[PDB]
Amino acid sequence: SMIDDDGYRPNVGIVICNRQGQVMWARRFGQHSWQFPQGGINPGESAEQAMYRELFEEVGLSRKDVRILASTRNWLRYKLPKRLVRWDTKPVCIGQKQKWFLLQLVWRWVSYWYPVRQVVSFKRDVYRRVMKEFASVVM
Ligand SMILES: [Ca+2]
């Protein structure tokens, strides 16, 4: 994933829901690391392409297994806390620009809003923004 001219790293995120309104989250890295699937967008690659790559890698699913219900048409941008920035590597990455996808099936299930409260502190505000946007699709 290449850093853009503003210093943002492009990423994709996936929210898979079921017909009961639960959402899926998976261990990003080992025990207790439950998070929505998320990964970088590489050069010469659309967000949708990156989404299917992350879906296959994290969940073992492909396009046939899911229906896209919604996505962020533009970017969800946020700045890293300054103490998380890798200040000695150029170009310096100061944030992420993210495209999120809401999927439904054609890891564990939790209530839709549960991840907003329970995810690691660093991603709570991003999760709140994402789930608020997708609320207009599912509520
Ligand atoms: Ca990933």
Which DSSP category does 136 fall into? H
Cα–ligand 1 centroid distance for 58 (angstroms): 6
Number of domains in the chain: 1
Contact 18/104 with Cβ under 8 angstroms? Answer: yes
CA of 2 to the centre of ligand 1 (A): 16
Cα separations in angstroms, 59 against 28, 54, 113: 11, 8, 21
| 30 Cα distance to chain centroid | 18
Ligand 1 centre to CA of 24 (Å) is 14
Ion ligand 1 — residues with CB under 5 Å? Answer: 39
The torsion defined by the Cα of 31, 34, 40 and 45, in degrees rounded to 10, comes to 120
Ligand 1 centroid vs 37 CA: distance in angstroms?
6
Residue 99's domain comprises 1-139
CA dist., res. 130 & res. 77, Å (int)? 11
Cβ neighbours of residue 37 closer than 8 Å, sequence gap 6 or more? 13, 14, 26, 54, 55, 57, 58, 59
| Experiment used for this model | X-ray
Phi, psi of 64 (to 5 degrees): -60, -25
* 84: CATH: 3.90.79.10
CA of 54 to the centre of ligand 1 (A): 6
